[PDB]
Structures are given as structure tokens and as C-alpha cells.
Design a protein around this ligand. Structure first.
Ligand SMILES: CC(C)(COP(=O)(O)OP(=O)(O)OC[C@H]1O[C@@H](n2cnc3c(N)ncnc32)[C@H](O)[C@@H]1OP(=O)(O)O)[C@@H](O)C(=O)NCCC(=O)NCCS(=O)O
Ligand SMILES: NC[C@H]1O[C@H](O[C@H]2[C@H](O)[C@@H](O[C@H]3O[C@H](CO)[C@@H](O)[C@H](N)[C@H]3O)[C@H](N)C[C@@H]2N)[C@H](O)[C@@H](O)[C@@H]1O
Length: 179
């Protein structure tokens, strides 16, 4: 995948990206909201994690802003494990999920995440005929939730004790965008 829209480039993750990703995912500012501050990656263990295979389609991408890599996304075709855990019914609809972080905190709350999401929405519509996109943020991450609401996602389910984060199972929302 490769998308360019003025300041933003979204492109496929390659092995050369992992040292900078290690910087992001050893940064306690970033880890508070993605992964958890108790994660202890090395370059090798991070690469192992981010090269684990997926049952169905996945896009792993790097987000660049003004020619500097600043974050990471993964965009994945929905699969049975997640349909089940989300209590989100499998239908004839084409559904994707997406996880992402901006690893440069100076680029938070400047609208870049919302620009990124909308570019992915457009890609999935034209390239995959997607009908819905879903994700599952922590209830106590309002910056993410508000970005997702700006982008068109709506809360559709409560997911109690959904995700272990820093030793505690955090309540989440299931949020859905339907074009
Ligand atoms: C979640 C992001 C990708 C969102 O992208 P970002 O570019 O920051 O979002 P945005 O388009 O600026 O929208 C954020 C909105 O929330 C607002 N906001 C910031 N902090 C807030 C808070 N504590 N409470 C409520 N709103 C807040 C912010 O001002 C902005 O609103 P606007 O000023 O545009 O009206 C990014 O903040 C990020 O990477 N954060 C750290 C990692 C992370 O949380 N990843 C997602 C995990 S979640 O499980 O999906
Ligand atoms: N709300 C978004 C959340 O996104 C991540 O968590 C997600 C993991 O990334 C997924 O893991 C997949 O991606 C890994 C990296 O490619 C692979 O190793 C692994 N085999 C894959 O299944 C897992 N399935 C769901 C989990 N919620 C963050 O850590 C978490 O903080 C944040 O809240």
C-alpha cells in the first residue's frame, strides 16, 4: 500500500522501519496509550511481534508526515476470533478493523489521526468495497474516542474487561463506521 496526500504518506511497513518503531514502543509517553508502559521490547522481540502472521488479510503501514515517519497502523479483514469477542455478527458485509498510534507525541491532537483514518476509509472502499470499519478503544482513552467520533465512528457496544493493559483488564468500546 502507498497513499500520498500532501503532508501525509501511508506506506507498507518494511524491516528498515523497526529501529524507529522500537524508539516509539520504548517511549513511555506512547506506551501509556498503546501496548502499555510495562511492555519491554528489544529490536528482535519487537520484530518477532510485528511479523506474526494473520489468518486473513492485513496491511501493516508506516505513517509519514512532512517526510518523517511518525506512526504505525495495521488494517485487517475481520475474522472469527474478533467477530466472537466483539459480539459483532458476521454478515455478508465486508468489514475491516484497524489499530494505530502516532509515535511522535508532538503530533497528537493536530488532526493528523483523523486525516489518516479518512484516507484508510477511502482506500478500503475503492479497493475492497468495504461496508464497515470497526475498532475497540479503551473507555479511558477519550482523545482516541473523540478522534474516531470526528471520523464517523459511533459507539455500538460496551466491552467490559476487554484488554489487559498495565496489569488491569480495561473496559473498551466497540465503535463502528458505516460509510
Ligand atoms: C489516537 C490518535 C491516533 C488520534 O489522532 P489525533 O491526530 O491525536 O486525533 P485528532 O484528529 O487531533 O482528534 C483528537 C481530538 O480529541 C481532542 N482531545 C485531546 N485530548 C482529549 C481529552 N483528554 N479528552 C477529550 N478530547 C481530547 C483533541 O483536541 C481533538 O479534538 P479537536 O481539537 O480536533 O476538536 C492519537 O492521539 C494517538 O496516536 N494517540 C496515542 C496512541 C493511541 O491512543 N492510539 C489508539 C489506541 S485506541 O485503543 O485505538
Ligand atoms: N484498541 C487497539 C489496541 O491495539 C493493540 O492491541 C491489539 C494487538 O495489536 C492485536 O495483535 C495483532 O497485532 C500484533 C502486532 O502486529 C500481532 O503480534 C498479533 N499476533 C496480532 O493479533 C490483538 N489481536 C488485539 C489487540 N487489541 C495495542 O497493543 C493496544 O494497546 C490497543 O488498545
Amino acid at each position: 500500500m502507498n497513499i500520498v496526500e500532501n503532508e501525509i504518506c501511508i506506506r507498507t511497513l518494511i524491516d528498515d522501519d523497526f529501529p524507529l518503531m522500537l524508539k516509539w514502543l520504548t517511549d513511555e509517553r506512547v506506551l501509556e496509550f498503546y501496548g502499555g508502559r510495562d511492555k519491554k521490547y528489544t529490536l528482535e522481540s519487537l520484530k518477532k511481534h510485528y511479523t506474526e502472521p494473520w489468518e486473513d488479510e492485513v496491511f501493516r503501514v508506516i505513517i509519514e508526515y512532512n517526510n518523517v515517519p511518525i506512526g504505525y497502523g495495521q488494517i485487517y479483514k475481520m475474522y472469527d476470533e474478533l467477530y466472537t469477542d466483539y459480539h459483532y455478527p458476521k454478515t455478508d458485509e465486508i468489514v475491516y478493523g484497524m489499530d494505530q498510534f502516532i509515535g511522535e507525541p508532538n503530533y497528537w491532537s493536530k488532526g493528523i489521526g483523523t486525516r489518516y483514518i479518512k484516507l484508510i476509509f477511502e482506500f478500503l472502499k475503492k479497493e475492497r468495497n468495504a461496508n464497515a470499519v470497526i475498532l475497540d478503544p479503551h473507555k479511558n482513552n477519550p482523545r482516541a474516542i473523540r478522534a474516531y467520533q470526528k471520523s464517523g465512528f459511533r459507539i455500538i457496544e460496551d466491552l467490559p474487561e476487554h484488554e489487559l493493559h498495565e496489569g488491569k483488564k480495561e473496559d473498551c468500546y466497540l465503535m463502528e463506521y458505516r460509510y
